[PDB]
Amino acid sequence: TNIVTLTRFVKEEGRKARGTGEMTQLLNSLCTAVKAISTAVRKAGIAHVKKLDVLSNDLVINVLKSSFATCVLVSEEDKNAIIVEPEKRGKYVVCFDPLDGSSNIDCLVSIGTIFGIYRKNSTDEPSEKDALQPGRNLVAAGYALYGSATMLVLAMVNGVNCFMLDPAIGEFILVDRDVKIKKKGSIYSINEGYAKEFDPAITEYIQRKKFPPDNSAPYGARYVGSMVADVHRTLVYGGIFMYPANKKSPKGKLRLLYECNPMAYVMEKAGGLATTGKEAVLDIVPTDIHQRAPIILGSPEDVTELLEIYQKHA
Amino acid sequence: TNIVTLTRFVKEEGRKARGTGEMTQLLNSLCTAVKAISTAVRKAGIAHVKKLDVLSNDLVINVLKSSFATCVLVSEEDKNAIIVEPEKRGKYVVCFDPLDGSSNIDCLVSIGTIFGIYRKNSTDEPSEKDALQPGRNLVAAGYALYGSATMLVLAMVNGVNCFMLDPAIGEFILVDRDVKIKKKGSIYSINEGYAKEFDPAITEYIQRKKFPPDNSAPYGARYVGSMVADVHRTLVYGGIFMYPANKKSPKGKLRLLYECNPMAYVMEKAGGLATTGKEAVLDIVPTDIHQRAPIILGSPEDVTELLEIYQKHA
Amino acid sequence: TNIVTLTRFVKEEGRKARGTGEMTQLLNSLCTAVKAISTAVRKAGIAHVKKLDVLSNDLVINVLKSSFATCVLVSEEDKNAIIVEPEKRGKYVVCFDPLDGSSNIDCLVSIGTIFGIYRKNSTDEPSEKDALQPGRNLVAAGYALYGSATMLVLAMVNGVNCFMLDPAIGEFILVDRDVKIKKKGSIYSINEGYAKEFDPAITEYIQRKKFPPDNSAPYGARYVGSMVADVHRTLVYGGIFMYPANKKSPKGKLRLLYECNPMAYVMEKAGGLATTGKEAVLDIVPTDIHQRAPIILGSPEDVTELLEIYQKHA
Amino acid sequence: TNIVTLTRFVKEEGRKARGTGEMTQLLNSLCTAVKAISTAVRKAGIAHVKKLDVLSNDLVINVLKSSFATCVLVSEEDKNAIIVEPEKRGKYVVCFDPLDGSSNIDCLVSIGTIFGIYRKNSTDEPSEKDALQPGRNLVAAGYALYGSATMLVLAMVNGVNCFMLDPAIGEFILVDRDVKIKKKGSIYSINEGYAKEFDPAITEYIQRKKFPPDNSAPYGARYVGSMVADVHRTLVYGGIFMYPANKKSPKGKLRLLYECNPMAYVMEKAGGLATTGKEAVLDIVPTDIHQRAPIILGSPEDVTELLEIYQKHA
């Protein structure tokens, strides 16, 4: 038998890259941590803010620490930036959310790990300074969906690729590439509990989805509650996902460095779009490692519609 | 080591039941089919209306056919009712949805199997006639959530019990019992794409959730798109789930026999409620095996609120 | 898909048996314990007279204790016979070796669980008295080989059947039945370290295997060191297995109740033979629960050859 | 959590090596193929000279072919040497036995993959010429035991290390290092069916093991029938393993390049010894890729004893 492995896939690409490939042992060190996570999660009740939320976070760090490719780490789970010591230093800064949606593990709701990889280009000894660059400085990014199946969407400068983990061989087999997203969708996904809090554009948009001006049949609504779940659905059947700013929290809820920025690199890399409503999520220069941002991503056409609105209203 | 297995759990209950226990080899024949399903689904991309949708449906029938406990089967996937031939006949009629949400497998969205078990009490040779009884005639019912973990909630006359499948030992280990649902929740889950189509009560209700009359902070909104997913979330953190009638399809979308009725037996058995808005889902006498019904279930208090509305408006 | 499960297989046989089937929940309670064992063993180094040797022994007892089919248990790992208390009593006495060959786990040598099941026919409150009957009083017996694959050979009054555990579905799928053993083999398996200790027959036999009197090409020699491994090889390619008496230990080394007797029920049930050299292992009336016996089993023709010798010499 | 992975282990060693590390993606490409093999084998009966014997052989080649580290491959399963084409060429020549002991898979006997890695040092376009070097030119070698657990012993210039595959995470976790073998053992393992065929030394040796001249208690005898099984036992509890020349086949049965040579690199690297009786297996310059050699390996002291004999007799 032949083909295929992520590793077998990444390396073959970094050949023509043509690269020193430490990127490869990074995604490897990463996959292992992902495989460990995937197994822990399918047996949460047999194993008895969440415990593993801690558990994964380390788990992931330790694999990254020992990949010999990283020099600065950012975990949605750490006060400050973790610096890789001199023996194990690599040329990569990796931002990640060890386990997104643990606030909702209990529903056997799908959850996942989000990551972004920047090449530290500084010559200075590493520090947070290196972890605050624009999204557009991503060499590689993606996530890991621990759903009915454990997938991993990886986007790199070339395009978007999907890998499903075959539990038995403990390998991530490439099952789709290079993914691209329908130009227009039939779905809007947003937490409408905040109807009260939303701005006019969002309000008018949603309105436009429920009652088509032209009267086309109305969009669907899906909101799972797990970002990595929602986007991916969005990335597959297209559509749009919204976690916009609300007056109470002006900058949304999703952390840009490890949550918003990556989903964007992916979205844009698959033909999608990612905006705050005010600007491309990716061109935002961050000042705070844990700073948040509102986010509107998905099918290029739908995202525009919203934008035209936001523009209309500003 | 000791404890625990469903089987080890059911049998111990049918002892004081005190029963002939064929119910037991039914849930066994069932679990096997569930374990087969769970594995197929975690490797859908490596395996390449849905193919398995057929696959599971048989798979499930064959295990039930050979449980020697069943005499009539109803699959959301079959024109007519399947009758178990004389050699393999049991005293049970089992209604089920082999794989709910396959219309959404592609998102590694959680999916599942829903089932209901009636004791054929007739003395007539079996037929569909036996599969159309009120929900209240359920000896046992529940579902199987193939999410990040593969759980199985089983409700029986006594109460509601939850089992997580430990992948390694291929066993369903009891991880929660006897489940009961918060009396009031912080969530409403409904497809709002149909805002246009909904009736006044539903409309006014949702309105009341977004902007609290008393001004309590508004509910959350979650809609995953997979019934078995949504309810279970509902059953765990409580709340409410709605797939109400809309003028276009006056009786909702979810099939009562294999989808609505079971979720109700469960809901009510855990302290919840299940109404069409007009009546308890369970007291509906069905005329058509594949007949549908609208459904409002979840936290007892929330469900009432809606009801008081429906009453208010009728 | 359809077929096949042990359970699905045993039950279908106890139907025409036609039985009350508690035998079934016994092999079920058993299989679970076997599945637990199989998993522990494939990860012994990751888990860090042997520890599990204890572990399995309980594990097995607890499943048997709760099968509600047993009333007296014999473990190569217990000073006295375990009596099942009144609430959980069944009509079966089960003799077993939780984990044979743990003295050799370290070589990732194959190891296994050996069991025998007698129907207590007494009307007396149960006790060891019930666990000491002739082999010929076995209702069911077999073993579990935890090798490259985890098989389970089960022999019952009808014939011999083999089941391989499919790790994924946690089910024992029937892969061979009804097994029968070549009438003559090309192999002898015996620990020749004891050349010094062996009697003349054994000595002359072995001699006859290395240098054919007629000059046919000599037998093979295989000795793995794990009884359950050796016999099964013997049962598959036929041949003969010997652990005969030696002057130092006149009655061999293998314990009759849980080790020798079962292998015999199996052997004879597959067309093989099992002798001490003096008599059929099965007709021996035991006085001591932990009493041993020498054992010569395998291809009917080979076993005879040895016997004719033993006879020749006595 | 932290530690440990082979990869995580090899790479850390090739750092101080300090190497270009393609050796690493070789053992990786290798492990994958090993994981694929391990799974196929534990479900041989559910999957229905051997079929997989072919299957593995390719499987292994394809992973090696795509490791980008190899330039010439030798499979006990191929007429001639496989040359890696220009795009995928690496600086390594890898000799291997895809699946040793398939002649004995049927007994759920343990089986395995044996490999040896030479650095092609030639400047010539690659060919078999490169695959025929002395054992002493091994950069890395080892095997994979698919027994009750799936281990992998890897020996490299530094010492011998053992890795057990944790089925769940699909990772080879280091469980022992750096292995060394008892200086003397209590076991001899040899196929005595060939008593007739053996030479005087072998004969006298065995004789000396059954009846101690000094009268120490006699050795044990173990012969599993699977080389990778037997040696490893030998490597763990020490002892000695013999597959010596017999007049009928003067050069033994085990193929030096892929079977004998590696077991030696390992043995000697763990403090053991490996001789034909005439010379160190490792210093033999091969002329034929598929050429065989007799082999005597194991505890240093025991091996000598035999040697002193061979010397005594020549």
Ligand SMILES: O=P(O)(O)OC[C@H]1O[C@](O)(CO)[C@@H](O)[C@@H]1O
């Ligand atoms: O130099 P490295 O370690 O190969 O990293 C660069 C990698 O990043 C990429 O730009 C995509 O992530 C590839 O071109 C290449 O594989």
Ligand SMILES: O=P(O)(O)OC[C@H]1O[C@](O)(CO)[C@@H](O)[C@@H]1O
């Ligand atoms: O419950 P809310 O306010 O809609 O926020 C849910 C969001 O939070 C997360 O759980 C992470 O904070 C995401 O998975 C999801 O998009």
Ligand SMILES: O=P(O)(O)OC[C@H]1O[C@](O)(CO)[C@@H](O)[C@@H]1O
């Ligand atoms: O007679 P049976 O086959 O045991 O079935 C009855 C079972 O149904 C129950 O009412 C619950 O499903 C239990 O009392 C009992 O285990």
Ligand SMILES: O=P(O)(O)OC[C@H]1O[C@](O)(CO)[C@@H](O)[C@@H]1O
């Ligand atoms: O997409 P809609 O119209 O909200 O319906 C989704 C419903 O359909 C189902 O997929 C089954 O028909 C359920 O899982 C879910 O509740």
Ligand SMILES: O=P(O)(O)OC[C@H]1O[C@](O)(CO)[C@@H](O)[C@@H]1O
């Ligand atoms: O009465 P039970 O519980 O079915 O046990 C008897 C079983 O034993 C057998 O003799 C074989 O073990 C079968 O005839 C039958 O399945």
Ligand SMILES: O=P(O)(O)OC[C@H]1O[C@](O)(CO)[C@@H](O)[C@@H]1O
């Ligand atoms: O090492 P010896 O003396 O040959 O005995 C090995 C025997 O002991 C056992 O390990 C059980 O006592 C069997 O598996 C095997 O037949």
Ligand SMILES: O=P(O)(O)OC[C@H]1O[C@](O)(CO)[C@@H](O)[C@@H]1O
């Ligand atoms: O140059 P490479 O690709 O790292 O290969 C050399 C490897 O071989 C070794 O000699 C052992 O196999 C190590 O020193 C080193 O890891």
Ligand SMILES: O=P(O)(O)OC[C@H]1O[C@](O)(CO)[C@@H](O)[C@@H]1O
């Ligand atoms: O059956 P024999 O002649 O002892 O040879 C067995 C040998 O053959 C092999 O199966 C490989 O040829 C080895 O595993 C084992 O050492």
Ligand SMILES: [Mg+2]
């Ligand atoms: Mg987190």
Ligand SMILES: [Mg+2]
């Ligand atoms: Mg998060």
Ligand SMILES: [Mg+2]
């Ligand atoms: Mg269906």
Ligand SMILES: [Mg+2]
């Ligand atoms: Mg459905």
Ligand SMILES: [Mg+2]
């Ligand atoms: Mg034991």
Ligand SMILES: [Mg+2]
């Ligand atoms: Mg034993």
Ligand SMILES: [Mg+2]
């Ligand atoms: Mg081979």
Ligand SMILES: [Mg+2]
């Ligand atoms: Mg071979």
